[PDB]
Amino acid sequence: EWYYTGSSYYNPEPISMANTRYVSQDTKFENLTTNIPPPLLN
Amino acid sequence: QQVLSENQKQIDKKFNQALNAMQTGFTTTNLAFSKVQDAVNANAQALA
Numbered sequence: 001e002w003y004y005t006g007s008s009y010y011n012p013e014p015i016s017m018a019n020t021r022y023v024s025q026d027t028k029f030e031n032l033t034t035n036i037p038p039p040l041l042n
Numbered sequence: 043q044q045v046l047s048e049n050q051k052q053i054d055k056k057f058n059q060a061l062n063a064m065q066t067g068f069t070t071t072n073l074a075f076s077k078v079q080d081a082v083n084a085n086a087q088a089l090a
């Protein structure tokens with residue numbers, strides 16, 4: 001569904017904790033409910 | 043994010059006021075306009 005890629009090259013990679021930072025919720029964020037990346041799991 | 047979400051209309055109004063305020067910044071008291079006029083005056087003074 002949603003993948004992580006680099007800012008200077010297109011390479012879709014799985015979303016991990018190394019790639020992502022926790023941020024406060026914004027209303028323009030995508031509420032995803034079917035497939036959830038592992039850093040957003042419990 | 044909460045401050046920007048709660049104060050969006052105030053931000054837009056202040057930005058519009060600041061962008062409409064630069065219409066009258068073309069007087070002699072402004073430093074940048076004085077520099078523009080100084081450049082034009084130097085260009086004229088060389089020919090003079």
Ligand SMILES: *[C@@H]1O[C@H](CO)[C@@H](O)[C@H](O)[C@H]1NC(C)=O
Pocket residue numbers: 027028029030031
């Ligand atoms: C995600 O949920 C928030 C919370 O209600 C909502 O404001 C926002 O519009 C939603 N975004 C999408 C893309 O569904």
